[model samples]
Target chain A: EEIRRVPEF
Target chain B: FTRYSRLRVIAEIRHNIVSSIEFDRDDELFATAGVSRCIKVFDFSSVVNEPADMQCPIVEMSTRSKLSCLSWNKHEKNHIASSDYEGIVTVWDVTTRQSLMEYEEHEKRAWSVDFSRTEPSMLVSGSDDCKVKVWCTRQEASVINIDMKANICCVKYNPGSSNYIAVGSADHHIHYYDLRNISQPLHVFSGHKKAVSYVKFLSNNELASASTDSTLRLWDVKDNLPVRTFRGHTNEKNFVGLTVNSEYLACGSETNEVYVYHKEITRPVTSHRFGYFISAVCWKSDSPTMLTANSQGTIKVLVLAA
Candidate 1:
């Protein structure tokens, strides 16, 4: 659940 | 800029009454004012998409003796807006609370520009056509340090990074940067618009975007002596057009009724649309993909670029 990663597609 | 989603902002005078338009920092509401003597705030966050909504009346409206010259929203206080008019007066005006408004009647000839302190919140800096002392408390105008740029001021803006720094664009065709902590002389002046200065809005902490009757849009890096990038090929027959920038693209309108969009370092406007009148102002919505534009033929439109 890191904030800066890619969106959960 | 397309035809489908543009709103008309005309109530009475069909002669370019909307002089300026600005989006609030978080982009829920936007402000529109011009020769109409009224500053109207619209509920844009509660929007109507795919069609141009009839902006016949705004949610909040404040009237004054003269048409507002320019205005800016408080980046800190979500509801407060500072607007200036032709009679050399800047009002510490408001909309809510159902009551009276504050005024700054200091300049002698006219006051063209004003912006609130980005970091200092309550602090305001304004540039005018005459003698100065433009800082204010709730009760009185303070005798702050007067930095001399030596010309009739056209537009003044605070750097987004700090409250101590301010910039002034003037009829002398120069952009003067000053530190409020030591407001005696300009640190450095950005000179080279062959005509009068049109606009100088901050792009980032270290960059500013400007447009002029010289038919150019330019980005200035405070670190350099020359414009870091110069954008050309737009008509600004009079110095009345505007420029607004976001992360990937910068936007403006030309006298030829064209909406010009330029990406970060691109030398030319990558895309433009002609709308059949003299387009005077433009702004990008921070929360949406729409671009708002106003033309001298008395139309304020929300243009969705194709």
Candidate 2:
């Protein structure tokens, strides 16, 4: 699985 | 599903213990630390007749100590590290049965410990002394000091970056520090009360925190809490959170038990009714999860679709 980038606000 | 599933062996203790975590590579192995004087290891694989029935296994090794927070080595399955009540940090080799090293510098209790994501020899710890210290573990002098202090609590090294680290502190704040710079790269003071627990989610940019008030999730760049999971009512403190590809989960200490996912809120998920549900960790391979209580009992719960 690809690493999920935590959404930057 | 039964309550009081494991009886007669619950360990007892005095001070309010804080958090627990598991090795990054191992699924059935984990470690627990709290107000107790020692750290305990639990291998779920040992309690079951076969590996398939290993749900809710028991403690396998109880290392006595007054430890606060613990984090497993990301690259080494057998190496673990923790900080104690005396502000001393210790590294242990579980496979070798050795206390690899200890570093003492903070004036007060060392509240948190974590290993650097990129460099194995470098480790970082935060304490009640109001300082964050980075150490070269493979070197000499048992040196206990900070390369720099961002002044935070419950500190954790960013899994995605070797040079980046984060801290939670009494100021109800979270600060991100870059190893190359002396000053914090980012500082966030959004938590309403003392930020007791902080963890980087599976996605390194988002963070989660637990405090006396509520549990919250924030984006790393903005450091603003975008979501708050508030069903916990009574002085919910010291949160332990972890995330996988499918979901993000958090456990806290209160009379009520709770867990949250990326999109679901308090009403959508089933709640476990237990008092002082303080510790939790996710298994690396599956949807099966492990949770521990203040009274020292650990339980294994399988998610619906697993």
Candidate 3:
């Protein structure tokens, strides 16, 4: 599982 | 669904952006701070009843730097604490309308400050300097210091136990600690994709954290697990607000909106859109009424419409 994702403004 | 409607809107000041706002323990008063370098305290009853344009703070105090956060002493009605962009932590006495003391040791900006619920004389502050400091109102210097691996955005003391605290960090982790042992955290909450911007204790055993990752996570302090994740509302660039009442959590958004979520549900129960970025949100203790502010300095008193 991918735990790191970028946030969207 | 609980719908929120704005009852009054405090007209925006031209240049003073409101960075933080908080309600006092008894909900009799609330304070607002920002780039204006001023802390204004308003009487709850007066603000709710008067026309917004004619309203004014009961007392206003000035500071040298822009304030980032504020905490009211749960036990002392006159005591309040604030952290500023200049790395200073100040304790203010509302009655005298003057600062009682200041702690200036952080090399960078001090982002957040919180007073202990059980011990009113004790306060904790976190800073971009990557340090969390514990101060005693009776002392001139910090009584304890805990260094972290990254910049700290917020610090909160556990409501039920004064010895325990939680720190939100730029390292994308929430560090839970017992003040008795400062060398290591009791548990490290991970999984947020971006920096953790804010953390509020929902209860003695649970807390809620907001991250720039655009999500809020509810954690079980006793079990060391992420109990739930709340989605919706954009919050990637700034620290919009995050506050929880007894039954619901309300947050400000970059999209110029306020979203309220029932604690048991992941989706927002209701939302009200505004004109500018919502900078701060705080609930009146255990009540459906809330105070919210924007980066442009507009403030609004909202209620859960029947």
Best by lDDT: 3
Clashing pairs in 2: B37-B65, B37-B66, B38-B64, B38-B65, B153-B168
Ranking by lDDT: 3, 2, 1
| Tens-digit per-residue lDDT, B117-137, candidate 1 | 464333334444334344443
The TM-scores, chain A only, for the candidates as listed are 0.33, 0.40, 0.48
Mark the regions of model 2 whose C-alpha exceeds 4 Å error after superposition. A1-9, B1-19, B48-64, B141-151, B222-233, B236-246, B263-268, B275-277, B280-288, B301-306
TM-score of 1: 0.69
Which 10-residue span in candidate 3 chain B carries the lowest summed lDDT?
B6-15
Residues B1-306 of candidate 2 have per-residue lDDT tens digits of 212222121222222443554534556566666655556666645533344344432433344456666777767777788887678888887776677877777777776788876776778888767767787777744334443333345777776676777666666666666667745445554655545455554445656555555555544444444554534434334444443323444454455354444333442243444534445444344343444444234444334221
> Per-residue lDDT of B276-296 in model 3, one digit per residue for the tens?
578889988777788988777
Tell me, by DockQ, which candidate is best: 3
Model 2: per-residue Cα lDDT at residue B175 = 66
Name the best candidate (by TM-score).
3
Docking quality class, candidate 1: incorrect
The global C-alpha lDDT for each of the candidates, from Candidate 1 onward, is 0.43, 0.54, 0.84
| TM-score of every model versus the real structure | 0.69, 0.74, 0.93
How many clashes does the backbone of model 3 have? 0
- DockQ score of each predicted structure, in the order shown: 0.01, 0.03, 0.05
